Amino acid sequence: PSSSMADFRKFFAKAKHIVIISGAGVSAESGVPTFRGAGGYWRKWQAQDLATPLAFAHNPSRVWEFYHYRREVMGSKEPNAGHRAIAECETRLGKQGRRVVVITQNIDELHRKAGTKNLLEIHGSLFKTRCTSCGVVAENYKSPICPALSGKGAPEPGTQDASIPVEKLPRCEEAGCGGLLRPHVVWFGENLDPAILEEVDRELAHCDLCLVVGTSSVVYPAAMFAPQVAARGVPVAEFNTETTPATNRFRFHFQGPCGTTLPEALA
């Protein structure tokens, strides 16, 4: 694990297919908290407990409050210099006939807002819904997503659940369905999309340089992506404020906010 930017740049200059894996840390400097420690809580509950099939099945109103809140917070948010460096890198290399692809754990769409085109959102999106009856996935940026959620989603401990009746939670507007919608987001304990996983596999297999940016490397299976490329003999560069369990697997580690390290790295 070197911290030599110059050695990384040598590899960067020659790379024809760069995979950039990102986690919540890439959006921290945008004012979107990660789930590490404090941001991992909402009212009395842990985010990793709310983001489960069990929690939603038994209390879809509380879970929707939680997602509504996040959708609303995400409204004000802007890509940071980390996101911008990544998008600009893709566009510049694209004109050289070189490839950059972003594989993100994040559901916040900030990579998209920054202009990134080659993007695999492996955990879905905060701004998509899926119908729990007919399975139809739709884009949704409505604020609020439904009338009953207005002013709701307050994260403060002791905030009673709005306890919205299920017919007044977001409902499918497909012809003759009316089903309860859920956020189109992969929850803990759910399968990732097999089609997306095969796209991920094709990128990992063909790439020649990999960056792992702002991820804890403890969410599976995404945590195994970069280790797998590094096993193939490919250089992996980690950009994170801390070391992680995967750190010593990687060729490079650059400590600090990725917003301040990425722009120089990717110029």
Partner: peptide
């Protein structure tokens, strides 16, 4: 592949 923390 199941999403796990």
């Amino acid at each position: 592949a199941v999403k796990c923390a």
